[PDB]
Amino acid sequence: PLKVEKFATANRGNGLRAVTPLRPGELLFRSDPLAYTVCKGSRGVVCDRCLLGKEKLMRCSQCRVAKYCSAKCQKKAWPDHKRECKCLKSCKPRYPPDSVRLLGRVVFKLMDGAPSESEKLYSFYDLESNINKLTEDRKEGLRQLVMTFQHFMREEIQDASQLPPAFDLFEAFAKVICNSFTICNAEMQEVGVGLYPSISLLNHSCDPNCSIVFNGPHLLLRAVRDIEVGEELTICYLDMLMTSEERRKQLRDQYCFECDCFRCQTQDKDADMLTGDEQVWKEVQESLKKIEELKAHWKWEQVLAMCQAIISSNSERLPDINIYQLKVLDCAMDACINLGLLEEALFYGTRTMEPYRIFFPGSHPVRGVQVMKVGKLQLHQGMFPQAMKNLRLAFDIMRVTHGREHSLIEDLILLLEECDANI
């Protein structure tokens, strides 16, 4: 039986609340997506279905846009790819925005598919759209998406009759804007985008009592604090490495609300996040736009070159607790891991440890994975005691955030065995 229930909140629409007392690490819900797709940067880098990277992917012979890691994945993806195939083919070489491909998959799923388990607590139809809060600029954006969708879908959908009854394309894209989940791989690289409508019941907190993790497109919702009966369940919608100003802008632009939490009222941590010379971190913040774009396209060599010019600059440097500096170190570490530059990766990774401890309090899956990456680097270098403390710390965090149902935990147990036996 469910440990969570939908309820109507006083001032933030519908939410989820505990039906029984919950402890850290308690599995609360598991969901596949109602619909999902690979993101623009990872298209052709990860399998369309299982979202795992591979040096060589096979492509769908009809559209040559969908790509897969194996015959099995291509075959199993076919029912949900079949109708989009003709639309993807007939629009080459124009590839649609991610949201447009995602909505295509929603419409086909709702038209041809059995009722989805993802919609057990809340369906696509119930999703919040924030229509009466959208700015004129946002509305103009949505109208362009509607027309893009109508074009993309021409081959399969000619009119309302082939859409679910009373389906409003404008309102559907509005739901997508505030309800899309970014799907991350085991290394916490963004690889996909999906709708998980039951999970969409979780309201936001900059200091949450729950967490979500992805294992391919499969999502796990876990408690990360003690939660009493009737208490609202919350997740953080946002990157932890953001100032209250940055959080304000995103919660406004994407989700149409103002956060009244304690952290927003007091600018909790903002001063520490922005230490170092303002001129310097402004330029770093600007450069990070290009760096993140490159990372999103798995361009590790170019990512590294740009990060090294900042980390080892001839001019003034930032403290590692500065969030822009911190992100640069994170990107540099990941580029080094993927390029096999393990010594350099470890230098960057170890410098991130204390700032991560500060910015990801309690149990957060991003800290757990970062700590696991550092311990794994230490283990490969044969620094067994330093490795063992980090692997154990990773396990303390990830047993709460990931749990036994996540395959990455089994990988970590192997690493602890390998390190413990060597000790």
Ligand X SMILES: C[S@@+](CC[C@H](N)C(=O)[O-])C[C@H]1O[C@@H](n2cnc3c(N)ncnc32)[C@H](O)[C@@H]1O
Instruction: Tell me which residue of 110, 124, 103, 119 sits closest to 29, measured CA to CA.
Output: 119
- Binds 47, which of Zn ion, ligand X, none (CB < 5 to 8 A, cut-off by type)? Zn ion
According to CB under 6 A, which one of 26, 80, 119, 128 is a site residue for ligand X? 128
According to CB under 5 A, which one of 69, 318, 332, 336 is a site residue for Zn ion? 69
- Binds 130, which of ligand X, Zn ion, none (CB < 5 to 8 A, cut-off by type)? ligand X
Instruction: Tell me which residue of 52, 122, 51, 111 sits closest to 79, measured CA to CA.
Output: 111
Of 60 and 387, which CB lies nearer to Zn ion in the complex structure?
Answer: 60
- The stretch among 45-53, 153-161, 211-219, 361-369 that binds Zn ion (CB under 5 A) is 45-53
According to CB under 6 A, which one of 257, 275, 297, 321 is a site residue for ligand X? 257
Instruction: Please count the residues of this chain forming the interface with ligand X, following the rule CB under 6 A.
Output: 16
- Binds 27, which of ligand X, Zn ion, none (CB < 5 to 8 A, cut-off by type)? none
Beginning with the edge strand found earlier in the chain, give each strand of the sheet holding 203-204 in spatial order: 4-8, 14-18, 232-235, 203-204
Q: Does 125 interact with ligand X (rule: CB under 6 A)?
A: no
230: annotated binding-site residue?
A: no
184: annotated binding-site residue?
A: no
d(CA 295, CA 303): 6
Q: Give the H or E element holding residue 47.
A: none
Burial class (CB in 10 A: 0-12, 13-18, 19+), 147: exposed
d(CA 208, CA 202): 10
On whether the CB atoms of residues 154 and 162 are closer than 8 A, the answer is no
On whether the CB atoms of residues 162 and 156 are closer than 8 A, the answer is yes
Q: Does 85 interact with Zn ion (rule: CB under 5 A)?
A: yes
341-380: b or e for each residue (b if 16 or more CB lie within 10 Å)? Answer: bbebbbbbbbbbbebbeebbeebbbbbbbbbbbbbbbbbe
According to CB under 6 A, which one of 91, 201, 284, 398 is a site residue for ligand X? 201
Min. distance of Cβ 205 from Zn ion in angstroms? 7
d(CA 183, CA 51): 9
Q: Computed from CA positions of residues 206, 31, 152, 54, in that sequence, does the dihedral angle turn out positive or negative? A: positive
According to CB under 6 A, which one of 173, 255, 324, 359 is a site residue for ligand X? 255
- Neighbouring CB atoms inside 10 A of 61's CB total 9
50: annotated binding-site residue?
A: yes
Min. distance of Cβ 11 from ligand X in angstroms? 7
Min. distance of Cβ 24 from Zn ion in angstroms? 21
69: annotated binding-site residue?
A: yes
On whether the CB atoms of residues 327 and 290 are closer than 8 A, the answer is no
Of 12 and 218, which CB lies nearer to ligand X in the complex structure?
Answer: 12
Within 13 Å and on the Cβ side, how many CA atoms surround 270? 14
81: annotated binding-site residue?
A: yes
- Binds 265, which of ligand X, Zn ion, none (CB < 5 to 8 A, cut-off by type)? none
CA 22 vs CA 91, 119, 202, 226, 398: distances in Å: 49, 23, 16, 6, 17
Contacting residues for 340 by C-beta, under 8 A, at least 6 apart:
none
On whether the CB atoms of residues 317 and 329 are closer than 8 A, the answer is no
- The stretch among 8-16, 45-53, 187-195, 241-249 that binds ligand X (CB under 6 A) is 8-16
- The stretch among 6-14, 34-42, 385-393, 409-417 that binds ligand X (CB under 6 A) is 6-14
Instruction: Tell me which residue of 261, 214, 256, 207 sits closest to 234, measured CA to CA.
Output: 207
336: annotated binding-site residue?
A: no
237: annotated binding-site residue?
A: yes
- Binds 200, which of ligand X, Zn ion, none (CB < 5 to 8 A, cut-off by type)? ligand X
322: annotated binding-site residue?
A: no
11: annotated binding-site residue?
A: no
Min. distance of Cβ 203 from Zn ion in angstroms? 11
Min. distance of Cβ 90 from Zn ion in angstroms? 11
Min. distance of Cβ 57 from Zn ion in angstroms? 9
14: annotated binding-site residue?
A: yes
According to CB under 6 A, which one of 18, 39, 186, 256 is a site residue for ligand X? 256
Contacting residues for 70 by C-beta, under 8 A, at least 6 apart:
47, 58
Residues that bind ligand X (CB under 6 A): 12-15, 128, 130, 178-179, 200-201, 203-204, 255-257, 259
Known binding residues: 12-14, 47, 50, 60, 63, 69, 73, 81, 85, 122, 130, 179, 203-204, 237, 257
Known binding residues for Zn(2+): 47, 50, 60, 63, 69, 73, 81, 85
